[PDB]
Amino acid sequence: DKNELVQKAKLAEQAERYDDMAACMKSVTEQGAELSNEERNLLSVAYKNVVGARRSSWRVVSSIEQKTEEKKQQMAREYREKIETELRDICNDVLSLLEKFLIPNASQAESKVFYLKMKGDYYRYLAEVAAGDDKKGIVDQSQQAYQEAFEISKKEMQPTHPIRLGLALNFSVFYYEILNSPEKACSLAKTAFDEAIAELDTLSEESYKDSTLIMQLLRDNLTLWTS
Amino acid sequence: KNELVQKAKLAEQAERYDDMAACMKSVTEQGAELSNEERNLLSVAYKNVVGARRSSWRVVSSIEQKTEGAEKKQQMAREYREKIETELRDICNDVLSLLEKFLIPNASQAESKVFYLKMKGDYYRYLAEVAAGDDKKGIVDQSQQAYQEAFEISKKEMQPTHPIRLGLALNFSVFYYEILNSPEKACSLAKTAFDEAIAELDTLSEESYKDSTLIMQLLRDNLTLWTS
Amino acid sequence: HNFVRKTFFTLAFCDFCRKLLFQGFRCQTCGYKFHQRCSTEVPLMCVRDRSSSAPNVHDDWEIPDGQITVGQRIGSGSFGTVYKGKWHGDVAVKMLNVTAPTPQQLQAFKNEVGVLRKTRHVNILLFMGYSTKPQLAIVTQWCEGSSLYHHLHIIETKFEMKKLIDIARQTAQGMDYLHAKSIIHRDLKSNNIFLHEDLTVKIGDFGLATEKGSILWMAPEVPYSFQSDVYAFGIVLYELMTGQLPYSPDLSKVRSNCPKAMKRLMAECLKKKRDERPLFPQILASIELLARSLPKIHRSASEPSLNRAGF
Numbered sequence: 234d235k236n237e238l239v240q241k242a243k244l245a246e247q248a249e250r251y252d253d254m255a256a257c258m259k260s261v262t263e264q265g266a267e268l269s270n271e272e273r274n275l276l277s278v279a280y281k282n283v284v285g286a287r288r289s290s291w292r293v294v295s296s297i298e299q300k301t302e303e304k305k306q307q308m309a310r311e312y313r314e315k316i317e318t319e320l321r322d323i324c325n326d327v328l329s330l331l332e333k334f335l336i337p338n339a340s341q342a343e344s345k346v347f348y349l350k351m352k353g354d355y356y357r358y359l360a361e362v363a364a365g366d367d368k369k370g371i372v373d374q375s376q377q378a379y380q381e382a383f384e385i386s387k388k389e390m391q392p393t394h395p396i397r398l399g400l401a402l403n404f405s406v407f408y409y410e411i412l413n414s415p416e417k418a419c420s421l422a423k424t425a426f427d428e429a430i431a432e433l434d435t436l437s438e439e440s441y442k443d444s445t446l447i448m449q450l451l452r453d454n455l456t457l458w459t460s
Numbered sequence: 461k462n463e464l465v466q467k468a469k470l471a472e473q474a475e476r477y478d479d480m481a482a483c484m485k486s487v488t489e490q491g492a493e494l495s496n497e498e499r500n501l502l503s504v505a506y507k508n509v510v511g512a513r514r515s516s517w518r519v520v521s522s523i524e525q526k527t528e529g530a531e532k533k534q535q536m537a538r539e540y541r542e543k544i545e546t547e548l549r550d551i552c553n554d555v556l557s558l559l560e561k562f563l564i565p566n567a568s569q570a571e572s573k574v575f576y577l578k579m580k581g582d583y584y585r586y587l588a589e590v591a592a593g594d595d596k597k598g599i600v601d602q603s604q605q606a607y608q609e610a611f612e613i614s615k616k617e618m619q620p621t622h623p624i625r626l627g628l629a630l631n632f633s634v635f636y637y638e639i640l641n642s643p644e645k646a647c648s649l650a651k652t653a654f655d656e657a658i659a660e661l662d663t664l665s666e667e668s669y670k671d672s673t674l675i676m677q678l679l680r681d682n683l684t685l686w687t688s
Numbered sequence: 689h690n691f692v693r694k695t696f697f698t699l700a701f702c703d704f705c706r707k708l709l710f711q712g713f714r715c716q717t718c719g720y721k722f723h724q725r726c727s728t729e730v731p732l733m734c735v736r737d738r739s740s741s742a743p744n745v746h747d748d749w750e751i752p753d754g755q756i757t758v759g760q761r762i763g764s765g766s767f768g769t770v771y772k773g774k775w776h777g778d779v780a781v782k783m784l785n786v787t788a789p790t791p792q793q794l795q796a797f798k799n800e801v802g803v804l805r806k807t808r809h810v811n812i813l814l815f816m817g818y819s820t821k822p823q824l825a826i827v828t829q830w831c832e833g834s835s836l837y838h839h840l841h842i843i844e845t846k847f848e849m850k851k852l853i854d855i856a857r858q859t860a861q862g863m864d865y866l867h868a869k870s871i872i873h874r875d876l877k878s879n880n881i882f883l884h885e886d887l888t889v890k891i892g893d894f895g896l897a898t899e900k901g902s903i904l905w906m907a908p909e910v911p912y913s914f915q916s917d918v919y920a921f922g923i924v925l926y927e928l929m930t931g932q933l934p935y936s937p938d939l940s941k942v943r944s945n946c947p948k949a950m951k952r953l954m955a956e957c958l959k960k961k962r963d964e965r966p967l968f969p970q971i972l973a974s975i976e977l978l979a980r981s982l983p984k985i986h987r988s989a990s991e992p993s994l995n996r997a998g999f
């Protein structure tokens with residue numbers, strides 16, 4: 234039952250083993266009912282750490298090959314592909330889960346932004362790995378999802394909201410890092426920081442220390458981008 | 461085969477230890493004696509695969525024994541712990557069968573034998589934390605035979621400051637304090653190894669100064685803790 | 689701060705008490721670490737104990753007079769002068785002032801030679817011999833690349849961030865050995881650091897232990913202790929990361945691409961009190977953590993997870 238699987242997933246939150254955490258929440262979602270916000274983060278963090286391990290691993294094996302350039306590198310090449318072929322499966326299972334079960338039954342403001350932003354991220358993570366033609370197809374999709382969430386959010390969410398700023402932070406990073414449009418990314422973040430701080434008191438005790446963290450994330454990105 | 465050795469070296473940097481161990485095991489299965497570089501890979505590979513489970517078990521077991529009375533919850537945590545333990549056991553058994561089938565039978569020099577035997581004495585101390593009942597005593601006895609055997613060869617063939625010997629005193633002394641609950645018998649073994657390396661300190665070498673001085677800090681830390 | 693559960697392989701040392709750490713928390717913003725025991729007393733101005741086990745592992749010296757060719761005076765100070773020369777190849781000579789020492793001074797020199805012939809760490813300047821007949825001198829290896837002070841101020845601009853950190857890594861990896869031999873290097877400074885070939889660092893000026901313009905590198909308490917050497921290493925970090933000279937130093941001057949893990953490392957070493965400072969076994973450990981995280985967490989900041997720990 235759903236209530237049981239939530240506990241069986243928070244047992245892998247503590248004591249890690251996130252591959253088990255994914256299995257519990259994945260089955261929870263397939264029931265078709267809308268997830269509670271607390272139950273929504275568990276599916277977010279369950280996959281945030283499964284991919285985050287291969288993302289970090291892929292980068293290191295990438296820097297090694299760029300530095301060796303050679304039978305050593307001929308083998309180090311096939312090992313980088315091994316990590317890539319895993320990132321593909323992890324991303325596909327989230328997207329199919331988002332497309333087939335979560336998004337269709339969202340039926341609420343905050344939920345719609347959450348799932349589309351998430352759909353945006355897991356397409357971006359494929360861009361960092363895919364080749365030219367596949368990158369373009371993937372790059373466009375990450376933008377439609379990002380843009381679609383970018384539309385609903387600005388219409389309905391408060392001036393300050395962790396999901397609101399979190400989409401601006403991730404959308405700008407998509408421009409700066411994937412589309413190589415530093416000024417296109419700079420303006421997006423700059424306004425988000427300005428709008429949020431202009432009305433900072435709209436936050437409240439339950440989330441102000443959560444949203445304020447993202448504001449430091451936005452400001453630091455601009456400082457690095459201005460240099 | 462060097463391909464396996466570099467594959468493991470690749471795996472360590474990527475931080476994929478479950479795949480690193482699967483390579484070093486395939487090296488050890490070939491019947492050749494490991495060099496002191498390949499040998500030190502097999503130690504790092506399996507002590508990280510096990511170290512994950514030991515960490516999972518030490519937190520689940522503390523979630524249990526808390527929130528007394530909630531039977532349905534405490535039934536869920538209890539059944540989860542014993543799933544970790546079986547996975548943890550399968551690792552230690554694989555290590556132990558690997559030592560006793562290929563490595564220990566063909567360890568020629570004293571250095572190797574004091575090394576492989578300490579491993580054998582370590583992986584039984586891991587099972588002694590998981591097992592219960594008569595099996596705990598059946599395991600704890602088996603640990604002492606390996607720790608004792610290595611200690612005799614160490615006292616005779618290796619210098620006081622050699623990190624292998626200076627670490628056998630650390631792991632063996634703990635086995636007396638935690639598994640056997642004998643503080644005095646642990647302190648005596650700890651103090652003895654500690655001073656013998658201090659007296660002959662200048663034998664320290666460029667290739668071992670950092671490794672040896674770390675263990676002497678760990679050895680001193682336990683002493684103060686136990687005497688605290 | 690926002691923390692998370694973390695289990696550490698390789699090595700780590702809790703930033704509060706600095707004992708070996710295997711299973712604890714850490715802060716995602718700055719990478720701070722700590723045990724659960726000391727979590728209740730971790731600072732918040734963000735700017736049943738158990739036992740630990742074994743962790744993972746990875747007369748003929750004298751030179752007769754006239755054999756050594758003497759070149760041009762490169763520099764002088766303290767109680768001697770430096771010259772380039774040739775003796776079985778390129779060499780360097782520290783010409784001490786005294787030519788006719790008293791037996792007590794000579795015996796002091798004899799003991800120093802007894803010590804200096806034992807130290808053979810890669811990141812210290814190789815010892816090649818001594819001479820008493822013409823004058824008190826010590827013969828070392830000659831490093832073509834001038835002192836690190838010369839590579840920041842005269843010829844400069846040739847240091848990437850990765851190479852910039854690696855120099856402070858070998859500086860500590862060489863001063864850890866000088867503490868594992870119980871020698872306090874009193875006068876560490878960027879002019880006492882040399883670069884031989886393909887940038888292999890070498891430390892000097894630690895000799896003359898028996899006998900034993902520098903204002904910038906002198907510690908505030910300088911007066912001598914292991915803690916005093918840590919501050920001197922802290923000042924060397926400031927010159928590297930900032931690319932300038934000191935003058936507290938302004939940490940804000942650092943480059944943009946240097947991560948905050950190095951920002952916090954430098955801040956500790958410059959701590960006013962001796963006690964709060966770390967020691968080189970740990971400094972050498974964090975800097976190798978800070979070095980493993982360059983090819984891994986180079987990025988433009990993404991979105992972090994909400995706080996998943998409370999204390």
Ligand SMILES: O=C(c1c(F)ccc(NS(=O)(=O)N2CC[C@H](F)C2)c1F)c1c[nH]c2ncc(-c3cnc(C4CC4)nc3)cc12
Nearest residue numbers: 770780781782813814815829830831834835892893894895
């Ligand atoms: O200065 C010394 C030196 C020495 F010769 C003898 C003794 C000591 N000190 S010691 O006795 O403590 N010492 C500790 C370890 C050693 F075993 C003994 C010295 F510090 C050098 C040794 N080799 C060098 N190569 C190059 C330069 C150099 C380069 N560029 C410049 C720029 C101005 C242009 N100036 C100078 C300097 C030295």
